Amino acid sequence: AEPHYIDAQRAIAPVDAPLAAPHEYAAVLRSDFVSSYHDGRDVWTDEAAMRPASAILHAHLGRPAVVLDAGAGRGRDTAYFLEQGHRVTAVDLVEPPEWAPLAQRWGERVRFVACPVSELDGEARFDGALDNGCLHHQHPDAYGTYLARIHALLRPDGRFTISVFESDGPGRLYANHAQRLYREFTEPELAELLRAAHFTPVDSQRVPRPKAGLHYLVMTARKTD
Ligand SMILES: Nc1ncnc2c1ncn2[C@@H]1O[C@H](CSCC[C@H](N)C(=O)O)[C@@H](O)[C@H]1O
Ligand SMILES: O=c1[nH]c(=O)c2ncnnc2[nH]1
Numbered sequence: 001a002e003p004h005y006i007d008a009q010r011a012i013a014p015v016d017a018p019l020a021a022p023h024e025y026a027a028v029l030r031s032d033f034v035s036s037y038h039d040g041r042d043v044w045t046d047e048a049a050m051r052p053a054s055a056i057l058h059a060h061l062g063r064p065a066v067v068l069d070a071g072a073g074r075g076r077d078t079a080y081f082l083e084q085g086h087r088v089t090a091v092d093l094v095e096p097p098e099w100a101p102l103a104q105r106w107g108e109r110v111r112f113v114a115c116p117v118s119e120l121d122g123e124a125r126f127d128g129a130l131d132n133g134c135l136h137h138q139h140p141d142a143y144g145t146y147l148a149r150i151h152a153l154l155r156p157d158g159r160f161t162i163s164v165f166e167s168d169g170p171g172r173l174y175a176n177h178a179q180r181l182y183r184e185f186t187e188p189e190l191a192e193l194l195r196a197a198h199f200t201p202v203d204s205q206r207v208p209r210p211k212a213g214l215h216y217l218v219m220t221a222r223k224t225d
Contacts, residue, residue, distance in 0.1 A: 001172045006165065007212060008043045012174035012182045020179070022139040026116070029137060030093045032178040037074075037094050044133060045074050049209040050163075053132045053218045054080040056205060057161035060220050061086075065127035068153060070117050071134025074098040081130075082106045089126070091117055117149055118142075124155045131162040133216075136183045140173065147197035151223065159220060160199055164190055166206060166215040190219050198224045 003013040020028060036042050044050055054077040057067070064085030069078045072090035075098050081088045082102075088110050090099070095114040102110055113120065117134070129150050138146050150160060167184035174182040185193070191201045199221035207216040 001174075003174075005212070006174070006176070006182055006214070007047075009041060010176045012176050015173045015175050015181070019139065019181075022142050025139045025142075025181070028179050029181075032176070032180040034094050035178070037096055042073065045076060047209065047211075049207055049212075049216060050076070050132060051080075052205070052207050053077070053161055053163040053216070054130060056203070056218055056220060057128050057130050057159060058084055058086075060159045060161065060203065061128050066125065068120075068126040068129040068150070070129055070131045070150060072112075073132075075102050077130055077132055078102060078110060079105075082110055086128075089113065091115060091120060117146055120149060120153060123152045126153050127155055127158055129154055129158065129160045131160070133163055135162055136164040136185070137181055139181065140183070143193065144197065147194075147199070151198055154223065156223065159202075159222060160194075161218065161220045162190075162194075163207070163216045163218045166217040185217055187217060187219070190217055194219065194221050195224070200224045 001014040003011050006012045067081045067086045067088050069088055069090040072078050072092045074096045078088050078090040091113045099112045165184040167186050171184045171186050171189050187204050194201055201219050201221045203220040205218045207218050
């Protein structure tokens, strides 16, 4: 494992020190994202390679439905889903100014919540859920509770689409200069994680990130029977 650029601006290096506890990490996590969005360093928002994941989830739904956008950012994917006729709930640690014009365009068809995914209450409220680059920044000790919440929020025939950094070789854990964590996955590793969280993968796609010289791994799953 060696340091490498993960996006236009940020180099990430393998973690070697002991990880901050999940409680302290949640603060490191929010701090980097609010600074990145404030500064306009959310280079993922306009990355072309980020667009296929939402179309992939819709393809697995096949009809207008009720969709959770987990870690929705500025709302690009939320807008995409709303244009397909979905009712969308968009959730993020950081509320960007773009949520207001989205609310003005789509009215009651969109709901925004500025909270952690883990805070979302309810069960069996969604037909689909999109995680477009959120899970792979969580504390590893929080993967299970994060995925369990998504699992509980989906209806029995729900579909979950998740996009992660694809690893070259066995995936490892990295951190950026702000100490935000980055996990890269191989397809077997991501499939193993979803299966352990009681999801059954039904699709996976290697989405090129041409300007970054990398790939996203975009996997779609149903609940395990
Ligand atoms: N535990 C958590 N709960 C909710 N949102 C989270 C989170 N951890 C990270 N995030 C949010 O997840 C996003 C990852 S960046 C990807 C943003 C968006 N999905 C897009 O496609 O452009 C950031 O907006 C970050 O604020
Ligand atoms: O720092 C980040 N850079 C990225 O390119 C990215 N892409 C998807 N999700 N999170 C990201 N975080």
